[PDB]
Amino acid sequence: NQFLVVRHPGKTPVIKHCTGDLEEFLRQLIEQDPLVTIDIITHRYYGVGGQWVQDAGEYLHMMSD
Amino acid sequence: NQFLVVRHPGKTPVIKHCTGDLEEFLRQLIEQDPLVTIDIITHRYYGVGGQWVQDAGEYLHMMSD
């Protein structure tokens, strides 16, 4: 959940930890950079090679509706 | 190097391991899906929280020129 990578245009991506409310944190990155892509990375028993990743857009909505 | 996440439009991203030549593997993902985004994730002593990620486009060129 705290292992998410945020991709800035014209630059290289960075991996960011939440400093507060998780929903707000993702929103804040999006709001300040609406071109930014966030992938949220976790781990599973099987997943995809023992690891899995979720689109932050699905993630943010998943927690609401 | 083998921890790279490939992002398909309309879907959710997956994390993929190379099955051959690394340069070819990234190219193959791009060629078959030119809309696809790849982030290549590694680890560092400091990096960004002890971890770092590189844009595959920079990565693929980095190894050439």
Swiss-Prot record, chains A, B:
Q: What is this protein called?
A: Protein ea22
Q: Which organism is it from?
A: Escherichia phage lambda (Bacteriophage lambda)
Which gene is the coding source of this polypeptide chain?
Answer: ea22
Q: Which region of the full protein is contained in this chain?
A: 110 to 174 of 182
